[PDB]
C-alpha cells in the first residue's frame, strides 16, 4: 500500500517528461509518458473533433512546434484513486500557444501511464 | 458567452445518460454520451492495461450487468476550461461493483461528448 | 465505515441548504449548514480583505439580497478526505450577481458543517 | 490580465512557506502565508470541532513539532477563480503525522493569503 504523496510524486515524474518534451519540442522525451494505446483529442476552429492516435501529438511536437525556453507549466491538479488518476496541466508560451490539458492516467504494471490527453487552446 | 454553471449543467445532462445507462444495464441509453472514437481503460488483476474501443463498455453493460435500482452515483467533480472538461464519477452498488471513473470530455459542434473513460474498481 | 458516495450525498444535503437560502434570500434556510465558528471572506472593490463572522453572510442575504427564482447553482467539486472536505459552488443570477464560492467543511459529531466560505464576485 | 500559470506559481510560493515552516518546525517561516484573521480547524479524537485562531497552529509547530527531514508534501490541487482559490496539500512523515490539508486563499492587495485551513489527520 502507498500514500497519496508517493503516487503524486510518481505521477509528476511522468508528467514532467510531457512538460519537458513540449518545451524542448522533442517527442522522444515525452513518448515514455504515454501508453501505446493513448489518444489525443481537441476541437478545431470549426468546433469539430480533431485528433486520434497519440503519434499525432508526437508529429505536431516534432514537426510544428519550436523549442520554447520561456514556456511555463503548472500541474494544477492530480486526482488519484487507486490505479486511476486524472491530472490538469496549464502551460503558457509554448510555441506561441497557451493550453489547458486534461490527462487520464492508469498505474500499469507498477508505473503510471497516460492513456488520454485532451486540450483546450486559449485565445491568443 | 457561456457561464461555468451553464456548461456544468450541459455536461451533467451528458454524464446522466452514462449513470442512467449503467443503472438500467442498457447501453442504448449511454451510447449518445460518447464519441465513436472514445476509449475505455482500466487495470486488470495482473495490473495489466485492459480495455480499448468504447464498444467494449457497451458490451459489458449489455451482456454482464443487470438493472441495479440501488446503484448510487456522485458526480464528484467537473473541471471545465473552454471546450475541454474533466469529470470524476463515483458509483456504489452497480451490478455488485464500486467504481471511481474519470472522464475526458470535449464540446464538439456545441455538444459535450466523452472521448475517454478510465476507472478504478474498489475491492470487496 | 462510509463511502465517498455516502459522504458526498451528506455534504450535498448541507450545501443544498446554502443554495436554497441564497435563492430564496432567507438566511434561516442556510444557517444550519454553518458552524457557529464559521467565517466568510472575499476581497472588496479596493482589493482589501472583507468579512469576518458568518453572520455577515446572513445579514447580506436578509437585508440586501432579493429572492432570485432564476438563480442557478452548480456544485462544481467536492473533495472528501476523512473528516475534512472542500467544495466549490458556482451561482448565476442571484440578486444580480454571479459568484464562485469555496467551502471548507468538517465532519463534526457525525455531521458535515461549513467552517469557512470564501468567494469571488464575477463581473455583471 | 493574469494567467492561471502565473497565479498558480504565486500561490505555490505562499504554500511553500507553510510546507517549509512545517518541515523545519519553525512557525516564523510559515507566518507570512496566513492572514492575521486566518483560522485553523480539525476534528479531535471525540469527533468534536477543534481549533480557532491561526496562532494555535504556530504554537503546535513550535512547541510540539520537531524538524522532520523525512517530510514530504504534495500540493495535490489549486483551484483558482479570480481573487479566490482553494488548495489541497498532503504531507507524509511530519513530526510523526500524515495530514491532508484544505486551504481557502484570497488575493488581497495583489498578494495571495490563507484565510482558512482545515485538516484531516490520517491513522498510524
Short mmCIF file of C-alpha atoms in Angstrom, two decimals:
data_model
loop_
_atom_site.label_atom_id
_atom_site.label_comp_id
_atom_site.label_asym_id
_atom_site.label_seq_id
_atom_site.Cartn_x
_atom_site.Cartn_y
_atom_site.Cartn_z
CA UNK A 1 0.00 0.00 0.00
CA UNK A 2 1.16 3.51 -0.99
CA UNK A 3 0.31 7.04 0.10
CA UNK A 4 -1.31 9.90 -1.89
CA UNK A 5 2.07 11.70 -1.63
CA UNK A 6 4.04 8.72 -3.04
CA UNK A 7 1.71 8.34 -6.03
CA UNK A 8 1.67 12.08 -6.61
CA UNK A 9 5.45 12.24 -6.90
CA UNK A 10 5.40 9.17 -9.28
CA UNK A 11 2.79 10.84 -11.47
CA UNK A 12 4.67 14.20 -11.50
CA UNK A 13 7.78 12.34 -12.69
CA UNK A 14 5.76 11.01 -15.68
CA UNK A 15 4.04 14.37 -16.44
CA UNK A 16 7.43 16.12 -16.09
CA UNK A 17 8.56 14.29 -19.25
CA UNK A 18 5.49 15.58 -21.09
CA UNK A 19 6.23 19.15 -19.99
CA UNK A 20 9.96 18.83 -20.88
CA UNK A 21 9.20 17.26 -24.34
CA UNK A 22 6.75 20.12 -25.02
CA UNK A 23 9.19 22.85 -24.04
CA UNK A 24 12.12 21.28 -25.95
CA UNK A 25 9.83 20.35 -28.90
CA UNK A 26 11.23 16.83 -28.75
CA UNK A 27 8.69 13.99 -28.77
CA UNK A 28 11.36 11.46 -27.74
CA UNK A 29 11.38 12.98 -24.23
CA UNK A 30 7.55 12.74 -23.78
CA UNK A 31 6.94 9.44 -25.53
CA UNK A 32 7.62 7.31 -22.39
CA UNK A 33 4.79 9.13 -20.53
CA UNK A 34 2.22 7.66 -22.92
CA UNK A 35 0.72 4.25 -23.41
CA UNK A 36 0.95 2.89 -26.94
CA UNK A 37 -2.88 2.90 -26.70
CA UNK A 38 -3.09 6.60 -25.82
CA UNK A 39 -5.24 9.07 -27.72
CA UNK A 40 -5.11 12.87 -28.09
CA UNK A 41 -8.17 14.99 -28.86
CA UNK A 42 -9.27 18.57 -29.06
CA UNK A 43 -11.69 20.71 -31.04
CA UNK A 44 -10.60 22.63 -34.13
CA UNK A 45 -11.51 26.18 -35.27
CA UNK A 46 -14.76 24.79 -36.79
CA UNK A 47 -15.65 23.11 -33.47
CA UNK A 48 -15.03 19.65 -34.92
CA UNK A 49 -13.31 16.80 -33.08
CA UNK A 50 -9.66 16.61 -34.02
CA UNK A 51 -7.04 14.03 -33.14
CA UNK A 52 -6.67 10.32 -32.77
CA UNK A 53 -3.61 8.17 -32.05
CA UNK A 54 -1.01 9.71 -29.75
CA UNK A 55 1.54 9.61 -32.63
CA UNK A 56 -0.40 12.67 -33.92
CA UNK A 57 0.79 14.60 -30.87
CA UNK A 58 4.43 13.47 -31.40
CA UNK A 59 4.12 14.56 -35.07
CA UNK A 60 2.94 18.09 -34.09
CA UNK A 61 5.62 18.37 -31.44
CA UNK A 62 8.38 17.26 -33.81
CA UNK A 63 7.26 19.00 -37.00
CA UNK A 64 5.28 22.10 -35.94
CA UNK A 65 6.47 23.25 -32.53
CA UNK A 66 9.65 25.19 -31.85
CA UNK A 67 11.72 24.96 -28.69
CA UNK A 68 10.16 27.30 -26.13
CA UNK A 69 12.65 28.40 -23.50
CA UNK A 70 10.07 30.68 -21.80
CA UNK A 71 7.29 28.04 -21.54
CA UNK A 72 5.94 27.64 -18.04
CA UNK A 73 3.67 24.76 -16.95
CA UNK A 74 1.57 24.33 -13.81
CA UNK A 75 0.34 20.92 -12.70
CA UNK A 76 -2.93 22.40 -11.40
CA UNK A 77 -4.44 19.17 -10.08
CA UNK A 78 -3.81 15.46 -9.69
CA UNK A 79 -6.74 13.34 -8.50
CA UNK A 80 -5.65 9.82 -7.55
CA UNK A 81 -7.90 6.89 -6.74
CA UNK A 82 -6.11 3.51 -6.58
CA UNK A 83 -4.88 2.57 -10.07
CA UNK A 84 -6.58 5.58 -11.76
CA UNK A 85 -5.68 9.26 -11.82
CA UNK A 86 -6.56 12.43 -13.58
CA UNK A 87 -4.41 15.47 -14.00
CA UNK A 88 -4.75 19.04 -15.23
CA UNK A 89 -1.78 20.89 -16.76
CA UNK A 90 -1.83 24.56 -17.73
CA UNK A 91 1.03 25.86 -20.00
CA UNK A 92 1.83 29.40 -21.08
CA UNK A 93 4.04 30.43 -24.00
CA UNK A 94 4.57 27.06 -25.61
CA UNK A 95 5.39 27.63 -29.28
CA UNK A 96 3.12 30.72 -29.25
CA UNK A 97 0.26 28.83 -27.54
CA UNK A 98 -1.46 28.76 -24.13
CA UNK A 99 -3.09 25.40 -23.28
CA UNK A 100 -5.12 23.63 -20.64
CA UNK A 101 -4.61 19.88 -20.83
CA UNK A 102 -6.56 17.08 -19.09
CA UNK A 103 -4.97 13.66 -18.71
CA UNK A 104 -6.33 10.25 -17.76
CA UNK A 105 -3.64 8.02 -16.29
CA UNK A 106 -3.51 4.42 -15.05
CA UNK A 107 -0.96 2.59 -12.99
CA UNK A 108 0.02 -0.27 -15.31
CA UNK A 109 2.44 -2.92 -14.05
CA UNK A 110 3.57 -0.55 -11.25
CA UNK A 111 4.11 2.51 -13.47
CA UNK A 112 1.77 5.38 -14.23
CA UNK A 113 0.96 5.91 -17.92
CA UNK A 114 -1.14 8.41 -19.86
CA UNK A 115 -3.98 6.79 -21.81
CA UNK A 116 -5.82 10.00 -22.85
CA UNK A 117 -4.87 13.64 -23.30
CA UNK A 118 -7.39 16.33 -24.26
CA UNK A 119 -6.76 20.05 -24.53
CA UNK A 120 -8.21 23.46 -24.95
CA UNK A 121 -6.23 26.12 -26.85
CA UNK A 122 -6.77 29.52 -25.24
CA UNK A 123 -7.33 32.55 -27.48
CA UNK A 124 -4.09 34.34 -28.45
CA UNK B 1 -20.51 33.61 -23.85
CA UNK B 2 -21.36 30.59 -21.68
CA UNK B 3 -21.04 30.57 -17.90
CA UNK B 4 -19.46 27.75 -15.81
CA UNK B 5 -22.97 26.94 -14.46
CA UNK B 6 -24.42 26.66 -17.99
CA UNK B 7 -21.64 24.33 -19.14
CA UNK B 8 -21.78 22.29 -15.96
CA UNK B 9 -25.46 21.60 -16.47
CA UNK B 10 -24.85 20.66 -20.08
CA UNK B 11 -22.12 18.18 -19.07
CA UNK B 12 -24.31 16.74 -16.28
CA UNK B 13 -27.04 16.05 -18.90
CA UNK B 14 -24.44 14.02 -20.81
CA UNK B 15 -22.98 12.23 -17.77
CA UNK B 16 -26.53 11.48 -16.56
CA UNK B 17 -27.03 9.23 -19.61
CA UNK B 18 -23.96 7.24 -18.63
CA UNK B 19 -25.18 6.91 -14.99
CA UNK B 20 -28.73 6.03 -16.15
CA UNK B 21 -27.48 3.55 -18.80
CA UNK B 22 -25.31 1.80 -16.21
CA UNK B 23 -28.08 1.57 -13.58
CA UNK B 24 -30.56 0.30 -16.18
CA UNK B 25 -27.90 -2.02 -17.72
CA UNK B 26 -28.85 -0.59 -21.10
CA UNK B 27 -26.05 0.55 -23.45
CA UNK B 28 -28.62 2.34 -25.71
CA UNK B 29 -29.20 5.00 -23.04
CA UNK B 30 -25.48 5.78 -22.53
CA UNK B 31 -24.35 5.50 -26.15
CA UNK B 32 -25.23 9.17 -27.02
CA UNK B 33 -22.76 10.36 -24.31
CA UNK B 34 -19.70 9.01 -26.09
CA UNK B 35 -17.84 9.91 -29.21
CA UNK B 36 -17.49 6.97 -31.72
CA UNK B 37 -13.74 7.35 -31.13
CA UNK B 38 -14.00 7.06 -27.29
CA UNK B 39 -11.89 4.57 -25.37
CA UNK B 40 -12.32 2.82 -22.01
CA UNK B 41 -9.35 1.64 -19.93
CA UNK B 42 -8.57 0.21 -16.56
CA UNK B 43 -6.10 -2.21 -14.97
CA UNK B 44 -6.86 -5.93 -14.52
CA UNK B 45 -6.00 -8.19 -11.52
CA UNK B 46 -2.48 -8.73 -13.00
CA UNK B 47 -2.00 -4.94 -13.14
CA UNK B 48 -2.20 -5.00 -16.93
CA UNK B 49 -3.93 -2.46 -19.12
CA UNK B 50 -7.39 -3.64 -20.10
CA UNK B 51 -9.87 -2.08 -22.45
CA UNK B 52 -10.00 -0.46 -25.88
CA UNK B 53 -12.80 0.99 -28.11
CA UNK B 54 -15.86 2.18 -26.10
CA UNK B 55 -17.98 -0.56 -27.78
CA UNK B 56 -16.37 -2.86 -25.20
CA UNK B 57 -18.07 -0.90 -22.43
CA UNK B 58 -21.45 -1.22 -24.16
CA UNK B 59 -20.92 -5.00 -24.47
CA UNK B 60 -20.20 -5.34 -20.73
CA UNK B 61 -23.29 -3.22 -19.87
CA UNK B 62 -25.50 -5.31 -22.18
CA UNK B 63 -24.05 -8.76 -21.51
CA UNK B 64 -22.63 -8.65 -17.94
CA UNK B 65 -24.51 -6.01 -15.89
CA UNK B 66 -28.13 -6.24 -14.74
CA UNK B 67 -30.50 -3.43 -13.64
CA UNK B 68 -29.27 -2.10 -10.29
CA UNK B 69 -32.03 0.00 -8.75
CA UNK B 70 -29.88 0.51 -5.58
CA UNK B 71 -26.96 1.99 -7.64
CA UNK B 72 -25.93 5.42 -6.33
CA UNK B 73 -23.73 7.77 -8.43
CA UNK B 74 -21.97 11.00 -7.40
CA UNK B 75 -20.55 13.40 -9.94
CA UNK B 76 -17.72 14.35 -7.59
CA UNK B 77 -16.08 16.98 -9.78
CA UNK B 78 -16.38 18.64 -13.20
CA UNK B 79 -13.46 20.88 -14.22
CA UNK B 80 -14.33 22.98 -17.28
CA UNK B 81 -11.95 25.09 -19.40
CA UNK B 82 -13.34 26.30 -22.71
CA UNK B 83 -14.01 23.33 -25.00
CA UNK B 84 -12.44 20.78 -22.62
CA UNK B 85 -13.66 19.19 -19.39
CA UNK B 86 -12.72 16.55 -16.91
CA UNK B 87 -15.14 14.73 -14.65
CA UNK B 88 -14.96 12.24 -11.78
CA UNK B 89 -17.94 9.96 -11.03
CA UNK B 90 -18.09 7.53 -8.09
CA UNK B 91 -20.69 4.76 -8.23
CA UNK B 92 -21.74 2.42 -5.39
CA UNK B 93 -23.58 -0.93 -5.82
CA UNK B 94 -23.68 -1.11 -9.58
CA UNK B 95 -24.11 -4.79 -10.57
CA UNK B 96 -22.11 -5.72 -7.42
CA UNK B 97 -19.35 -3.19 -8.08
CA UNK B 98 -17.99 0.06 -6.64
CA UNK B 99 -16.08 2.27 -9.14
CA UNK B 100 -14.30 5.60 -9.46
CA UNK B 101 -14.42 6.83 -13.10
CA UNK B 102 -12.52 9.68 -14.67
CA UNK B 103 -13.78 11.16 -17.91
CA UNK B 104 -12.28 13.45 -20.57
CA UNK B 105 -14.91 15.42 -22.47
CA UNK B 106 -14.86 17.86 -25.44
CA UNK B 107 -17.54 20.35 -26.60
CA UNK B 108 -17.87 19.22 -30.23
CA UNK B 109 -20.20 21.17 -32.54
CA UNK B 110 -21.85 22.72 -29.48
CA UNK B 111 -22.39 19.45 -27.63
CA UNK B 112 -20.30 17.86 -24.88
CA UNK B 113 -19.08 14.32 -25.61
CA UNK B 114 -16.88 11.78 -23.79
CA UNK B 115 -13.66 10.78 -25.57
CA UNK B 116 -12.10 8.78 -22.67
CA UNK B 117 -13.25 6.91 -19.61
CA UNK B 118 -10.90 5.26 -17.16
CA UNK B 119 -11.82 3.56 -13.91
CA UNK B 120 -10.67 2.00 -10.73
CA UNK B 121 -12.62 -0.93 -9.31
CA UNK B 122 -12.75 -0.75 -5.49
CA UNK B 123 -12.39 -4.05 -3.54
CA UNK B 124 -15.00 -6.18 -1.74
CA UNK C 1 -17.06 2.89 7.50
CA UNK C 2 -18.55 5.21 4.85
CA UNK C 3 -18.06 5.51 1.12
CA UNK C 4 -17.25 8.52 -0.97
CA UNK C 5 -20.80 8.49 -2.47
CA UNK C 6 -22.36 8.41 1.00
CA UNK C 7 -20.26 11.33 2.28
CA UNK C 8 -20.88 13.17 -1.00
CA UNK C 9 -24.65 12.83 -0.56
CA UNK C 10 -24.39 14.10 3.04
CA UNK C 11 -22.37 17.17 2.01
CA UNK C 12 -24.74 17.97 -0.89
CA UNK C 13 -27.67 17.93 1.58
CA UNK C 14 -25.80 20.56 3.60
CA UNK C 15 -24.67 22.65 0.62
CA UNK C 16 -28.24 22.44 -0.82
CA UNK C 17 -29.47 24.47 2.19
CA UNK C 18 -26.94 27.13 1.30
CA UNK C 19 -28.14 27.26 -2.35
CA UNK C 20 -31.83 27.34 -1.31
CA UNK C 21 -31.23 30.05 1.32
CA UNK C 22 -29.45 32.19 -1.28
CA UNK C 23 -32.13 31.72 -3.94
CA UNK C 24 -34.97 32.47 -1.52
CA UNK C 25 -32.96 35.26 0.18
CA UNK C 26 -33.72 33.66 3.57
CA UNK C 27 -30.75 33.18 5.91
CA UNK C 28 -32.74 30.80 8.18
CA UNK C 29 -32.66 28.09 5.49
CA UNK C 30 -28.85 28.21 5.21
CA UNK C 31 -27.96 28.84 8.85
CA UNK C 32 -27.91 25.09 9.71
CA UNK C 33 -25.05 24.46 7.17
CA UNK C 34 -22.59 26.63 9.14
CA UNK C 35 -20.62 26.16 12.32
CA UNK C 36 -21.13 28.93 14.96
CA UNK C 37 -17.34 29.42 14.37
CA UNK C 38 -17.70 29.82 10.61
CA UNK C 39 -16.25 32.79 8.73
CA UNK C 40 -16.82 34.49 5.40
CA UNK C 41 -14.24 36.39 3.41
CA UNK C 42 -13.71 37.88 -0.02
CA UNK C 43 -11.96 40.91 -1.49
CA UNK C 44 -13.72 44.27 -1.97
CA UNK C 45 -13.53 46.77 -4.84
CA UNK C 46 -10.25 48.17 -3.37
CA UNK C 47 -8.63 44.68 -3.20
CA UNK C 48 -8.96 44.63 0.57
CA UNK C 49 -9.98 41.67 2.72
CA UNK C 50 -13.63 41.97 3.73
CA UNK C 51 -15.68 39.69 6.00
CA UNK C 52 -15.45 38.06 9.41
CA UNK C 53 -18.11 36.00 11.28
CA UNK C 54 -20.56 34.12 9.06
CA UNK C 55 -23.39 36.29 10.37
CA UNK C 56 -22.14 38.86 7.82
CA UNK C 57 -23.28 36.49 5.07
CA UNK C 58 -26.70 36.08 6.75
CA UNK C 59 -27.03 39.90 7.01
CA UNK C 60 -26.35 40.38 3.25
CA UNK C 61 -28.82 37.59 2.38
CA UNK C 62 -31.52 39.00 4.65
CA UNK C 63 -31.02 42.74 4.17
CA UNK C 64 -29.54 43.23 0.70
CA UNK C 65 -30.47 40.21 -1.48
CA UNK C 66 -33.92 39.66 -3.01
CA UNK C 67 -35.49 36.30 -3.89
CA UNK C 68 -33.99 35.10 -7.17
CA UNK C 69 -36.26 32.50 -8.77
CA UNK C 70 -34.00 32.31 -11.85
CA UNK C 71 -30.78 31.69 -9.77
CA UNK C 72 -28.89 28.54 -10.87
CA UNK C 73 -26.17 26.90 -8.80
CA UNK C 74 -23.63 24.21 -9.66
CA UNK C 75 -21.77 22.24 -7.03
CA UNK C 76 -18.69 22.03 -9.30
CA UNK C 77 -16.50 19.89 -6.98
CA UNK C 78 -16.49 18.18 -3.57
CA UNK C 79 -13.14 16.75 -2.42
CA UNK C 80 -13.51 14.47 0.65
CA UNK C 81 -10.71 13.15 2.85
CA UNK C 82 -11.86 11.52 6.02
CA UNK C 83 -13.27 14.21 8.35
CA UNK C 84 -12.37 17.14 6.05
CA UNK C 85 -13.79 18.32 2.73
CA UNK C 86 -13.58 21.12 0.23
CA UNK C 87 -16.31 22.29 -2.11
CA UNK C 88 -16.69 24.73 -4.99
CA UNK C 89 -20.08 26.20 -5.86
CA UNK C 90 -20.78 28.43 -8.85
CA UNK C 91 -24.02 30.50 -8.90
CA UNK C 92 -25.54 32.59 -11.75
CA UNK C 93 -28.20 35.31 -11.38
CA UNK C 94 -28.51 35.53 -7.63
CA UNK C 95 -29.76 39.07 -6.86
CA UNK C 96 -27.94 40.38 -9.93
CA UNK C 97 -24.61 38.67 -9.11
CA UNK C 98 -22.54 35.71 -10.32
CA UNK C 99 -20.27 34.08 -7.73
CA UNK C 100 -17.74 31.34 -7.32
CA UNK C 101 -17.66 30.09 -3.68
CA UNK C 102 -15.17 27.87 -1.99
CA UNK C 103 -16.09 25.98 1.22
CA UNK C 104 -14.05 24.17 3.85
CA UNK C 105 -16.14 21.62 5.73
CA UNK C 106 -15.55 19.26 8.64
CA UNK C 107 -17.46 16.23 9.85
CA UNK C 108 -18.25 17.21 13.40
CA UNK C 109 -20.01 14.74 15.66
CA UNK C 110 -21.24 12.80 12.62
CA UNK C 111 -22.43 15.85 10.67
CA UNK C 112 -20.79 17.95 7.91
CA UNK C 113 -20.57 21.64 8.68
CA UNK C 114 -19.05 24.64 6.96
CA UNK C 115 -16.27 26.43 8.89
CA UNK C 116 -15.13 28.78 6.11
CA UNK C 117 -16.61 30.25 2.92
CA UNK C 118 -14.75 32.48 0.53
CA UNK C 119 -15.95 33.90 -2.73
CA UNK C 120 -15.12 35.73 -5.93
CA UNK C 121 -17.75 38.08 -7.41
CA UNK C 122 -17.68 37.94 -11.18
CA UNK C 123 -18.32 41.00 -13.46
CA UNK C 124 -22.03 41.82 -14.01
CA UNK D 1 -4.67 40.17 -17.19
CA UNK D 2 -3.02 37.25 -15.29
CA UNK D 3 -2.93 33.66 -16.42
CA UNK D 4 -3.70 30.52 -14.40
CA UNK D 5 0.02 29.56 -14.54
CA UNK D 6 1.02 32.98 -13.13
CA UNK D 7 -1.44 32.75 -10.24
CA UNK D 8 -0.59 29.13 -9.62
CA UNK D 9 3.10 29.98 -9.13
CA UNK D 10 2.23 32.95 -6.86
CA UNK D 11 0.08 30.65 -4.71
CA UNK D 12 2.75 27.90 -4.56
CA UNK D 13 5.29 30.48 -3.29
CA UNK D 14 2.87 31.16 -0.40
CA UNK D 15 2.07 27.49 0.29
CA UNK D 16 5.81 26.62 0.10
CA UNK D 17 6.32 28.70 3.26
CA UNK D 18 3.70 26.57 5.01
CA UNK D 19 5.37 23.30 3.93
CA UNK D 20 8.83 24.71 4.81
CA UNK D 21 7.77 26.07 8.29
CA UNK D 22 6.15 22.72 8.97
CA UNK D 23 9.17 20.60 7.95
CA UNK D 24 11.67 22.79 9.85
CA UNK D 25 9.21 23.06 12.79
CA UNK D 26 9.58 26.87 12.65
CA UNK D 27 6.39 28.95 12.67
CA UNK D 28 8.29 32.15 11.69
CA UNK D 29 8.76 30.65 8.21
CA UNK D 30 5.01 29.96 7.77
CA UNK D 31 3.56 33.01 9.43
CA UNK D 32 3.67 35.25 6.27
CA UNK D 33 1.43 32.73 4.47
CA UNK D 34 -1.58 33.45 6.74
CA UNK D 35 -3.84 36.41 7.16
CA UNK D 36 -3.97 37.75 10.70
CA UNK D 37 -7.68 36.73 10.67
CA UNK D 38 -6.98 33.15 9.50
CA UNK D 39 -8.48 30.15 11.28
CA UNK D 40 -7.47 26.52 11.62
CA UNK D 41 -9.89 23.72 12.44
CA UNK D 42 -9.97 19.98 12.55
CA UNK D 43 -11.89 17.31 14.45
CA UNK D 44 -10.41 15.80 17.66
CA UNK D 45 -10.45 12.11 18.70
CA UNK D 46 -14.01 12.63 20.11
CA UNK D 47 -15.17 13.96 16.72
CA UNK D 48 -15.51 17.47 18.18
CA UNK D 49 -14.51 20.71 16.45
CA UNK D 50 -11.04 21.80 17.48
CA UNK D 51 -9.06 24.91 16.65
CA UNK D 52 -9.55 28.63 16.21
CA UNK D 53 -7.07 31.42 15.52
CA UNK D 54 -4.11 30.52 13.39
CA UNK D 55 -1.79 31.39 16.34
CA UNK D 56 -2.84 27.94 17.64
CA UNK D 57 -1.17 26.39 14.59
CA UNK D 58 2.04 28.29 15.28
CA UNK D 59 2.04 27.06 18.90
CA UNK D 60 1.87 23.41 17.82
CA UNK D 61 4.62 23.94 15.22
CA UNK D 62 6.96 25.49 17.79
CA UNK D 63 6.08 23.50 20.93
CA UNK D 64 5.08 20.03 19.64
CA UNK D 65 6.72 19.51 16.24
CA UNK D 66 10.42 18.77 15.69
CA UNK D 67 12.36 19.16 12.44
CA UNK D 68 11.34 16.31 10.09
CA UNK D 69 13.91 15.64 7.41
CA UNK D 70 11.78 12.75 6.03
CA UNK D 71 8.67 15.04 5.49
CA UNK D 72 7.21 15.07 2.00
CA UNK D 73 4.42 17.39 0.90
CA UNK D 74 2.31 17.29 -2.31
CA UNK D 75 0.28 20.28 -3.49
CA UNK D 76 -2.48 18.00 -4.82
CA UNK D 77 -4.75 20.71 -6.30
CA UNK D 78 -5.03 24.51 -6.65
CA UNK D 79 -8.39 25.75 -8.00
CA UNK D 80 -8.18 29.45 -8.95
CA UNK D 81 -11.09 31.76 -9.78
CA UNK D 82 -10.30 35.48 -9.86
CA UNK D 83 -9.41 36.68 -6.35
CA UNK D 84 -10.29 33.33 -4.71
CA UNK D 85 -8.50 29.99 -4.62
CA UNK D 86 -8.64 26.67 -2.90
CA UNK D 87 -5.74 24.29 -2.35
CA UNK D 88 -5.22 20.76 -1.11
CA UNK D 89 -1.87 19.71 0.39
CA UNK D 90 -0.99 16.20 1.50
CA UNK D 91 2.01 15.66 3.83
CA UNK D 92 3.68 12.39 4.89
CA UNK D 93 6.03 11.88 7.86
CA UNK D 94 5.83 15.32 9.50
CA UNK D 95 6.65 15.04 13.23
CA UNK D 96 5.17 11.51 13.08
CA UNK D 97 1.92 12.51 11.33
CA UNK D 98 0.28 12.16 7.91
CA UNK D 99 -2.15 15.01 7.00
CA UNK D 100 -4.44 16.19 4.29
CA UNK D 101 -4.98 20.00 4.47
CA UNK D 102 -7.55 22.17 2.66
CA UNK D 103 -6.86 25.86 2.24
CA UNK D 104 -9.03 28.82 1.31
CA UNK D 105 -6.97 31.71 -0.12
CA UNK D 106 -7.79 35.21 -1.28
CA UNK D 107 -5.71 37.61 -3.34
CA UNK D 108 -5.55 40.60 -1.02
CA UNK D 109 -3.91 43.75 -2.32
CA UNK D 110 -2.08 41.81 -5.01
CA UNK D 111 -0.83 39.03 -2.70
CA UNK D 112 -2.33 35.64 -2.00
CA UNK D 113 -3.10 34.89 1.66
CA UNK D 114 -4.61 31.91 3.57
CA UNK D 115 -7.80 32.77 5.49
CA UNK D 116 -8.73 29.19 6.44
CA UNK D 117 -7.01 25.88 6.86
CA UNK D 118 -8.67 22.66 7.81
CA UNK D 119 -7.08 19.22 8.07
CA UNK D 120 -7.64 15.51 8.48
CA UNK D 121 -5.07 13.51 10.45
CA UNK D 122 -4.54 10.07 8.89
CA UNK D 123 -4.19 6.98 11.10
CA UNK D 124 -0.88 5.44 12.13
#
